[PDB]
Assembly symmetry: C3
Homo-oligomer: 114 residues x 3
């Protein structure tokens, strides 16, 4: 999978090791090899949640399979847990969009995964 | 719903109060309490629209339902109108991608909306 | 169509003609007039691919049709080629997500493309 988090938390509040932690925990959660996991953290964003600029995050998780009802509830628990612990963002100020990608619609290494 | 704007307009040209105006106007247009609305504005972007670096915007609106032909036209008039008035972006230099999200594919507060 | 590239490559390493080159190459490759093509490059990103912070890129291509198996493979060879030549990113550290948008789900000019 590919995990993107946009947040109004400042860059200096993103701890050392965060990208590696996300990579490792997504590998653990999805069972997928870390060598194909991509993570992207975008701090200092101009955003509001419910009209408030208290800490919040808008995230997305794209996966070729491993997306579904129970899996997504599990990912949300995991990922909100990590954002709360490491970036001090309340889980009720986080949205995560999940996308099940067709392999033919993911390009990589001059081709696609089809 | 969640509304994201990426634009080459500089930060200093985003007016004070713009995130609140977007929240209010989206709540009114969708008939939803502002507590459910998230907004995100990303200025100073390196982008081109039709080969031109004149002011432009690439946006997205994600909603669990309430997406379709007529509603999307109405959102586009509202949102292009706001971007023209507040950021001085011509409506024909705006793209808005509309996404009808399944509740099971939106995470919030350690779970999903399913 | 709309092409977005997020990358950890620094802003200074993006050649000055890069947006125009993307616009022209995508117009050639998609058979669309360049007036319809939007391009967006986001450097200096905090991202990792396979746990590594070597240069990498996470991209997307949105089109109303002109998306599918062989077409996406051709787009990936073209776009990986440009990212390797111009930004010095290895093709095996690039993801490109392809999205076939319905015309009624793309807003533009106060309406949609429906
Ligand atoms: O299996 C996966 O989750 C997976 C997902 C992506 C991906 C990239 N963009 N969106 C999804 C890439 C590679 C993957 O592994 C093979
Ligand atoms: O208003 C929306 O559709 C909406 C959209 C997002 C969102 C965030 N990322 N992508 C979409 C989040 C919250 C939202 O409020 C809800 C939330 C649950 C619902 C469940 C059933 C019906 C309607 C709902 C509405
Ligand atoms: O026809 C197309 O491919 C096309 C696609 C877009 C687009 C912008 N965002 N997503 C899709 C815009 C204009 C187009 O013309």
């Amino acid at each position: 999978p590919m995990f993107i988090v946009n947040t109004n938390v400042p860059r200096a509040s993103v701890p050392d090791g965060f990208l590696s932690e996300l990579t490792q925990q997504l590998a653990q959660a999805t069972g997928k090899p870390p060598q194909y996991i991509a993570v992207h953290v975008v701090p200092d964003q101009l955003m509001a949640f419910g009209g408030s600029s208290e800490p919040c995050a808008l995230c997305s998780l794209h996966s070729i399979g491993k997306i579904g009802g129970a899996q997504n509830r599990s990912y949300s628990k995991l990922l909100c847990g990590l954002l709360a612990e490491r970036l001090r963002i309340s889980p009720d100020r986080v949205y995560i969009n999940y996308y099940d990608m067709n392999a033919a619609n993911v390009g990589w290494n001059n081709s696609t995964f089809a």
